[PDB]
């Protein structure tokens with residue numbers, strides 16, 4: 001009964017229809033986000049604002065930078081990265097040496113001491129591999145978490161995000177935590193000259209092939225953005241001349257109820273089983289840490305309604321984090337014959353039919369399209385805000401982008417761009433993907449700082 005396959009697919013659609021957002025739902029999200037951005041920039045409203053709009057102390061144009069050898073660090077994912085970059089006049093910057101280290105779970109959710117102990121050890125090993133523990137290299141730290149800066153080289157951790165939990169770190173100076181751990185070893189000795197967010201590093205690295213780049217966006221494990229604000233609008237910092245980079249931390253949009261009309265059963269479940277429940281709600285709609293898991297929960301509801309896999313879920317389907325976000329990419333990469341969907345599901349202990357496979361594709365499409373559209377309301381907000389703070393009628397702007405979801409998902413990018421463009425009339429937006437953008441961005445900022 002091919003009649004009874006399509007009826008299963010008609011009911012799957014009534015459920016999937018819940019992930020739709022109309023163009024006016026997006027304009028509403030966009031307005032409300034723009035409203036939170038305003039509140040985050042104001043001294044009077046900053047403390048209660050869910051979008052924090054944090055000053056980064058990376059000021060518009062700089063004066064002259066030093067040249068030579070820098071060491072970049074990158075902490076934010078489930079891996080920590082070290083790299084040596086050569087900066088030179090032309091401004092230009094090149095990746096010379098690189099090395100990535102997997103983070104022991106016990107350093108993610110143990111103590112700050114443990115975490116930065118592990119970080120320092122990696123730095124010690126790296127410098128050995130390349131006999132470098134003697135030149136006192138200037139160190140740039142890309143640290144992908146909300147920080148309140150007093151300066152380029154001094155700022156405190158506001159709260160962890162993305163499942164990080166190391167105790168004894170929130171409220172403390174992050175650069176100090178790094179410096180202490182280095183000194184605990186006898187390493188040693190780096191001049192830590194700059195700490196930046198990954199959005200910031202990505203914008204800075206894209207700037208040199210395109211001077212129009214004044215926005216940085218990350219859509220990886222988490223989702224965030226930064227942009228060049230007018231110093232007159234940054235009430236938290238002294239001075240009204242020139243421009244400064246602002247770290248939106250827009251992931252926390254919705255933490256005071258701003259997205260409530262849009263949250264689904266699946267989002268509440270994802271929020272409630274997370275390391276930070278009630279927090280980073282906008283990010284949990286978009287980021288790759290949460291995307292596959294959201295798809296998993298849709299498949300469980302489809303299984304419970306007798307619409308999928310004969311109404312039975314494998315032990316693998318019922319385990320946390322088992323539908324990887326990469327599987328969302330790989331399912332939507334399928335070229336029509338269902339073989340990629342088949343092997344993913346088969347490896348998950350399921351016995352899928354042709355129509356099971358197609359339904360799983362529809363679930364992935366529903367979840368990632370929503371992410372793409374929710375994300376576009378954020379960027380459009382930022383860019384509409386920037387058009388309105390400036391004098392020209394048409395704003396010509398470049399956006400620097402990194403993150404595995406934007407980069408590796410076969411169609412996120414195209415859905416995302418088209419939606420941004422419907423929401424940003426009178427803007428001409430160029431999107432560029434960064435090349436080793438964190439490390440190169442950190443060293444470039446460091447060269448000006450020292």
Ligand SMILES: Nc1ncnc2c1ncn2[C@@H]1O[C@H](COP(=O)(O)OP(=O)(O)NP(=O)(O)O)[C@@H](O)[C@H]1O
Pocket residue numbers: 076077078144162198218219220221222223287288289324325326329402403404405408409
């Ligand atoms: N092929 C893929 N397509 C989409 N997502 C993926 C893919 N591979 C891995 N991911 C997910 O993307 C996340 C890693 O993204 P990536 O951007 O490489 O790291 P990141 O930039 O450190 N993340 P963030 O903390 O947001 O900056 C993981 O949570 C994965 O589940």
Ligand SMILES: Cn1ccnc1Sc1cc(C(=O)Nc2nccs2)c(N)cc1F
Pocket residue numbers: 057058059060061062152203204207211213214228444445446448449
């Ligand atoms: C993005 N954009 C657009 C024109 N101005 C900027 S910001 C920008 C800032 C810095 C920079 O390092 N600024 C610093 N301010 C204080 C210490 S370092 C840079 N090294 C390169 C840049 F492009």
Ligand SMILES: OC[C@H]1O[C@H](O)[C@H](O)[C@@H](O)[C@@H]1O
Pocket residue numbers: 076143144145146161162197198199218220221222223224225249251283
């Ligand atoms: O890694 C991307 C983003 O992840 C989380 O949202 C962090 O809070 C933010 O600082 C970072 O930029």
Ligand SMILES: [K+]
Pocket residue numbers: 231232233234235236237238239240
């Ligand atoms: K100011």
Ligand SMILES: [Mg+2]
Pocket residue numbers: 076144198218220
């Ligand atoms: Mg990152």
